[model samples]
Structures are given as C-alpha cells and as structure tokens.
Target: MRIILLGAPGAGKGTQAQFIMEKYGIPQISTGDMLRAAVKSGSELGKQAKDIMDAGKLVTDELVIALVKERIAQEDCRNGFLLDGFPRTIPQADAMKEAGINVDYVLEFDVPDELIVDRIVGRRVHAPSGRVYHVKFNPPKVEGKDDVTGEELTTRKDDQEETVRKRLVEYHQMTAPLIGYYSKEAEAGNTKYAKVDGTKPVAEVRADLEKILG
Candidate 1:
C-alpha cells in the first residue's frame, strides 16, 4: 500500500496519517523529516543532502526524489510506506514513475478554503511541546492553558485569517495541477485516487478513509 497523501494545512491530514500508519503498519515518510534523518545518519545521500544544505542552497528535486527512493527501500517499508508531502510537482511524480516506484493510492483530504480557514484560525499550540488545540473544536482543559503542563498556549502568526487565506491560494496553485495530473493517471488505471471529505468531524473522516482504503 504505497500511499501518497494530499491535504491543506489544518485539514487533519496529520491525524489521519497516524491512523493510516498504525492501521496498515506502514511508516509515514515525511520528506523533510527524511532529509534530517538522512543527514544525521550520514548515509550517502544524507551526506550529500547535508553538504547541499550547509552551502545554503536549495536541495534539488532530483536529490529529494533520491532521498525518497532511499527511504521507501528500507526494511520497514517492505509492507508499504505512506508518502507525506513529496512529489509536489509533475516532474517529481515523473521521477517516481521513472524509478519504477509504483504508487497504490493517491489520497486527498478534500476541504474547502473557507472551512480550512475556519479550522486554522482557531488553532493554538503549546509552542515548546508542539501540542495543538483549537479554541472551539478542541479547547484545552483550562481555557488557554496546556492540558498536561499548564503552560499558556499561543497563537502563531501563520494561523491568522489572512495568512491562512494566503496559504490556501498557494496550496491551490501547488495542488490543482497535481490533482489534474493524477486524475488522468487514475483514469488510465495506474493507481486509485481517493478524496475524503476533510470538513467532516475527525472520526467521521476516519470512517471515510476506512471505506477508501479497504
């Protein structure tokens, strides 16, 4: 079950990603995390990735795809791996195809821009721990305090309405063509493209995922 995941920020992609990983016993291969791990481990590509970053240069798409190829080849990935945010463009997708990395599913968490904005605007995080809460949807135990440590929660600038809206625009720009690209591939029967409603409650959305993944 090689899965490529798609979703805007604050659409509960992370939560469902955990669910999918546990249910299928697959690793969630986040590319950014992959690079950091590679560099830390000093693997051939990881060393190369570190050198590129040390020089203050952008890591090329080829290198990213190479890292991805290295990651999904691991022992744990034998069952399968879930790709969390790589292949952001057609060329990267092409690189996977050229490398003979066949994807089983392209899963999209489909949420409208308005709903995403609403979800993001209420988000607060206990900065040091990275624990998140939503004022209306998932409030902390003591109004503005972290449930575990009692530390105050903070609103990030990125969560503001304008910032979220800006990101939504960028998300559409980045994702729309990829969606189009994959729809054609799906029609050709190479892989299944499944869209789950992200606006629904989290549990409801998980049920939708079960239907699709089964």
Candidate 2:
C-alpha cells in the first residue's frame, strides 16, 4: 500500500506515520532524510547533493526525483513505503507517474487552522523544569506562570502565535492544491484518496486510517 501522507505542520502526520509504519511493517521515507543518508554514503548522487547543499542551494527536481527513485528501489521498499515531505507540487507527482512509480493511496489529514493554532501556538514550556503545557489544554494556574514555583512560562519562538499562524497558512496554501490533484486521480481510478480528521485524538485517527486501509 504505497501512500503519500499529506498534512500541515501540527496535523499529527508524523505521529500517525509512525503507527502506520510499525503496524504495516513498511518503512517511512522522507526526502530530506534520504538526501542526508545518500550524502553520508558518499555515492555519486551523494556527492552531487553535498555540492548543492554546501552551496546553500536547493537540489533541483531532477536530482530529488533521482534520489527518491533510488531509495525506493532498495529492498526495504519492496512491500511499500510511506512517503512524507516529497512531491509537494504536481511536477514531482507527475514525474513519479512517468517513472511508473504508481501510488496506491493519497491519505490526507485535514485539520482546521484554528485547531492547529490551539494545538501548537499555545505551548508554554518551563525549560529548566522540562515541563511543557498548552494554554488551550493544560494551562497553568497563573496564566503566564508555571504551576509549581510560579515562574514565568517561556513561550518558544516557534510557538509564538504569529509565527505558528503564518506557518499554518503557508502550509495550507502550498499543499491544499495537491488534494484536488489527487482527488481527480482517485476519480480516474488511478489511486484511492482518503482524508481523515486530524483534529481527533491520535488513537481515534489511527482507527479511522485502519478502517480505510483495511
């Protein structure tokens, strides 16, 4: 069951990917991680990737597709692989099809921006104590302070409301179109498309995926 897992930053794609990978006994593949591995292996592709990376430039689509093709050709992907963070645009998806790497499913986790903001933007961490809290869920007693010693809860830059919202919008804009692209493919009987509510609890989401995947 080859799949392209789609979701925003806090949509729990990684969390569910872990469950899917273990339960189905399929390896999870990420382009970035694969590129790093290729470079470390010192193969020809790795050397080229290293040169581009060292120049602080992004690798072209041709090279990225080549790396993905190489990775999936390995024995571990014989059954299938869970793909995350590749084919962000139609070009790469088309390239995969042209290469005869047909996908069985396009599984998307659809969560609202409001819910994602609540999940991520409200994180308050007590760095020294190593305790983290979410304002919308596990808020402390004094609002901006920690529970035990009454110290100010520090909000990391990544979790700042503005930054988190911006990321959500950016992700939404970039990946939303892939839904339509895959949906059309589904109608054509080229692949199955399943969109789950990522706002649900992790187990509940997993259950939904199981129902579909089964």
Candidate 3:
C-alpha cells in the first residue's frame, strides 16, 4: 500500500507511523532520514546536498525528490512504503506525479494547533540513549532527568513552541494543498484520501488505518 502520512509536527505521526510500519511490514520513508543516509554515503547527490547545507541553505526540491526516488526503488520498497515526510509543497507533489510514482492513499492526521504546540514543547529527550519523555503525558521518573541514566534531559530547538508553530504554518501553506490534490484523485477512483483524527489513542487510530489499508 503506497501511502502518504501527513500531519503537523507533534501530531503523533511518528507514533502512528510505527504502528503502520509494524502492521504492514513496510518501511516508513522519511526525508530527513533519507537525506542523512545519502549525505553519509557521499553519493554525488549527497555531496551536492552537503555543499548546500554547509552554505546554510535548504536542499533543493529536485535533489530531495531524486533521493526519494532512489529510496523507493530499493528492494524493501517492492511491496510498498509509507511516506512520512517529503513533498511538503505542491511543486514536490507535482514532481512526484510527473515522475509517475503512484500513491494508493493519502492519510492526513488532523490535530488542533494548540494541542500540537503542547505536545511538541512538552517533549524532552535523554541525549545519550535518545529516549523520549513527555512532560504532559509521559513524564520521567525524576524532574528534568533521564530515568535510566540519571542524566539531564534536553529539549530540542526544533521542539520549541516558536519553531514548531512556524513549521505548522509552513505545513498548512504547502502540504495542505496535497489534501485537495489527493481528494480529487481519489474521487476520480485513482486513489484514496482520508483524514484521520490524530487525537485518538494510538491503537484506535491504527485500527481505523488497518481497515483503510484493507
């Protein structure tokens, strides 16, 4: 099932992605992970991306889509894969269509902005082991510390309220169009587009998603 999982940061997309991947046995294709792997391997495109990063500029959409194309062609993606992040703009969506990659469904995880902000800013990570703890929902055993290693917990800059809000705005401006795009495609019987409530318990969302996939 070739699918796109769309959600704002801290909308539990990552958690739901884990459920989808485990249930379906398909890799979750994340652009961030893909870029890091590409850059580490020192591929020609990676080198170009590295140069762009070194210059403190965003990687071009062409390079990003190229990396995604390479990733989805891998053996593991033969059955299908869930796209977690990529095509954050209509242009990228257009490029994917132009490149002839067919999507079977588009799933949007809808959550309110206020909840998104709270979920993101409340996140804390234990740096050494990379364990995550949430202030609001899942607190650590001790305040401001990693329960396992007794180390300080830190919040990422990207997880800050301002940064997350900015990202949400960008998501709405760019990726929101994809909702319309896929809706049209699905109405035409070309594919399916769905909006799932992200605020529900993970298991509940997963059950609904399983039905959708079937």
Candidate 4:
C-alpha cells in the first residue's frame, strides 16, 4: 500500500507511522530523514543539496522531488512505502503527480488545533537523556524530576504555547490546500483518502486505519 501520512505537529503521526510500518512490513519514508541520509552519503544529489544548504537557501521543490524519486527507487520500496512529511504544499503534491508517482492512500490524522496546542504545551522532557513526559497524561514521578535519574524536567522552546500556535498556523495554511488537492484526486479515482481522528487512543486510531486500508 503506497500511503501518505498527514497530521499536524503533536498529532501522533509518528506513533501511527510506526504501527503501519510493522504491520505492513513497508518502509516509512520521511523527507527530513531522507535528506539527511542523502547528505551524509555524499551522493551527487547530496552534494547538490548540501551546496544549496551552504548557500543558506531553502531546497527547491525540484531538488526535493529528485531526492524522493531516488529514495523510492531503492530495493526496500519495491513493495510500497509510507510517505511522511513530504508533499507539505500543493506544489509538492503537483510535482509528485507530474512525476507520475501514484499514491494509493492519504491518511490524514485529524485533531483540533486547541487539543493539539494543549497536547504540545503540556510536554516536558529530560534533555540530557531525551526522556519525554506530558504534564497532563504522563507527568513525572516527582513534580519535575526524571523518574530514573531525578534530573529536572524542562519544557522545550518548541513546546511553548506561542511556538506551537505559530507552527499550527503555518501547518494549516500549507496543508489545507493539499487536502483539497488529494480529495479531488480521490474523487477522480486516482487514490483513496481518509481522515483518522488523531485525538483517539493510539490503538483506536490504528484500528480505524486498518478498517479503511484493509
């Protein structure tokens, strides 16, 4: 199943992606991860991407599409792959279509912005060990101390309400159009599109996905 997983920050796309990968035995293709891997491997595309980065400019859609094409052509993606964090904009989606890359499903994890804000703002972490907790769902044993090491737990800047709200604004602006784009594709019989409730429990969300994709 060729799938594209979509969700806002803190909407649990990472967790769902993990479940899908294990159940289907398909690789999860993340644009950020792919770019990093390519840059590290020092391939021709890597050099081009690195040069663009060195110039302090954003990597163009052309470069990103080229990298994605190279990645999906690898042996591991023969069966299928789940795309995460790519096609964030309509242009990227257009480029994918232009390249004749067929997407079987677009699973959008839907959650209200208010809930997403609450979810992210409540997060706390032990920076040294990368241990994470949520003030509301999974607080530390001792108010703000790590359970294992008793280290102080701190909130990251990225977890601040203001920062999260800003990101939410950006995500909505960029993704709303793509949702329409894919819906039209689905209507045209080119793909299957479904929205999974992200606020549901992880298992419940997975169940919903299975019901749709199976």
Q: Provide C-alpha RMSD values for all models, in order.
A: 5.5, 8.0, 4.6, 5.9
Candidate 2 lDDT, tens digit per residue, 37-70? 5676776775567655444334577877887888
Off by over 4 Å in 1: 32-60, 121-135, 138-163
In terms of lDDT, the poorest run of 10 residues in model 4 is 50-59
User: Candidate 4 lDDT, tens digit per residue, 20-94?
Assistant: 888999988776445545676776665556544433234577777777888889999999999887787788888
Among all candidates shown, the one with the greatest TM-score: 3
* TM-score pick, better of 3 and 4: 3
Stretches of candidate 2 off by over 4 Å are 32-63, 117-166
Q: Relative to the unseen true structure, what is the C-alpha lDDT of residue 142 in candidate 4, on a scale of 0 to 100?
A: 92
77: Cα error in model 2, Å? 0.4
Put down candidate 3 lDDT per residue, 1-214, tens digits, no spaces.
7888877767776557767787889888877555655676776766566544433234678888887888888999999898877776778888888888888988888888879888877888664444566787768899889887889988754566666767777777767787788888889998888888888876788788888888
For each candidate, what is the lDDT?
0.75, 0.74, 0.75, 0.76
TM-score (C-alpha) between model 1 and the true structure: 0.72
True lDDT of residue 186, candidate 4 = 92
Give all TM-scores, in the order shown: 0.72, 0.68, 0.78, 0.73
Show the lowest summed lDDT stretch of 10 residues, model 2. Answer: 50-59
Q: In model 3, what is the error at residue 113, expressed in angstroms?
A: 0.9
